[model samples]
Target chain A: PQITLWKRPLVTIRIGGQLKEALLDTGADDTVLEEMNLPGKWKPKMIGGIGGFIKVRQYDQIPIEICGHKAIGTVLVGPTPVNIIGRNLLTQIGCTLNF
Target chain B: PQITLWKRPLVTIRIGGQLKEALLDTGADDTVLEEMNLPGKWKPKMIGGIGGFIKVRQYDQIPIEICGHKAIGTVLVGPTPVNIIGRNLLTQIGCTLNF
Candidate 1:
């Protein structure tokens, strides 16, 4: 599937048996999600964004279904306006940027 | 051009006779650049991001050559760790996401 950039590239995803939408962010290094409870241990981590730095909880080896493509990687949970599917998970789904 | 998501999709862009690198960010609504001086009148604006919000100088109708592709649109200058080429400019270059 090819997604045009005319609008925000938001897609449906499944995590923890919950349906959610996230933006396919090529600029983001790691996937970050809205604050939610997940089973497992997480550590506090800091990440940089366009505006400033923020602290988040990093959960490793979390399985996520991104647009039906399965990926297992680290997921950061914190206060965010929207969920972001970054390059960390995009690579697992064989996503690319084309012009 | 097709860019894989294995690494940060940083590309060289020419703006105001200066060469700079920027990330192709689909999550960002507007293009944001590092603090730099640009001519013409600009208005002070604020934009929201993953972590928080920040103030920026919004300059419109700026000519920029993104990877040799010509695009003239709004560019925001502020304190950012890396230059971001957001959807505002990505649309002009006909960029898309593919899986």
Candidate 2:
């Protein structure tokens, strides 16, 4: 399949009266969001992995429509300066990259 | 406030019967979990940031007790090989680092 690397427009999310920008990265597998930008009311949950278990929270998932394409996934909220678009959307849409 | 950088023992989080490892990042602002390791049932939501809106999901938050200290937060589910400990628990418990 051909791979397509598209630079979708940046999106701003509002949390606790703050906003942040995120990039759409197909190389990634999940939707990641910064924690500092998260708002109140979102509860953190426990996650088990190879190393061990960790805590996390969920706020809201933003809708991203790029090139008339859209996909919905969970954003792993953290404290970075940007957001990422990973496989969550890429694989779902069955995308191919051509550079 | 004093900052403390402690290398806590890594924990294993189980999702869909799969396990992964995550690091405790004090410098971070929120708890982050990789999405690839997430199990089914978690739903992704739309998150609006400075740029726009994106989608995300919710997973379980693992319990972490270090040096007799413990806190619970949400793991921003995403697609990474590691997990992080950010301010979600740091700020709540006034901590200082000693190097």
Candidate 3:
């Protein structure tokens, strides 16, 4: 299925068993969510964005369901303004840029 | 044409008569370029990112060539870490998310 690149491209995704609508951000290298509780061991990491870098907890092998497509990858939880689904998980769901 | 969203989708884009590689960012709302001279009157605008918001110069109807595709639209030229091809111009070239 092909999805239109609407303004902001918001989609519902399930992360850590919680259903949330996150931005489909190809600009981001990894998925980032606002501070959340997850069952995993994480390491402190800094993620750089357009504005600047923020300290986050990087958790590996996290399971996320994007519109029903299941993916397991790295997820960074921090004090982010919004939930973001980055390229790391997009690839697993077969998302791409086409013309 | 399909482009694989590699580690980072870097593609050569022609902006303001100069060739620059920009990240094909599906997450960004507007096309943002590094500081450059564009032939137009720009207004001060605030752009919000993951970290925060920044003051930018928003120019209207700016011409840009992305991977040989013609795209002329509102472009925000400002101080940014990298040149980003946002959803604004990506839609002009019929770029989308596929599964």
**Best DockQ among the predictions, by candidate number:** 1
- TM-score per model over all chains: 0.97, 0.31, 0.95
Query: How well is each residue in A36-95 modelled by candidate 3, as lDDT tens digits?
Result: 988879999998766777899999999899988999999999999889998889889888
lDDT of 1 at B80: 75
TM-score of chain A of each: 0.96, 0.47, 0.93
Flag regions of model 1 displaced more than 4 Å. none
Candidate 3 segments whose C-alpha is farther than 4 A from its true place: none
Separate DockQ for every predicted complex: 0.86, 0.02, 0.75
* Interface quality of candidate 3 as DockQ: 0.75
In model 3, the Cα lDDT at residue B99 comes to 78
What are the RMSDs of all candidates, in order?
0.9, 17.9, 1.2
Number of the top lDDT candidate: 1
Tell me the whole-model lDDT of each prediction, alpha carbons only.
Answer: 0.92, 0.44, 0.87
Give per-residue CA lDDT, model 2, range A16-98, as digits (tens): 44545555343234555555444335656544332334454655554554333555545566543356544555444444321
Question: Per-residue alpha-carbon lDDT of model 1 for B3-28, expressed as tens digits?
Answer: 99888999999998899999999988
Candidate 2's DockQ is 0.02
Error of 1 at B42 (Å): 0.8
The model with the greater lDDT, 2 or 3, is: 3
TM-score, model 3 to reference: 0.95
Supply the TM-score for candidate 1: 0.97
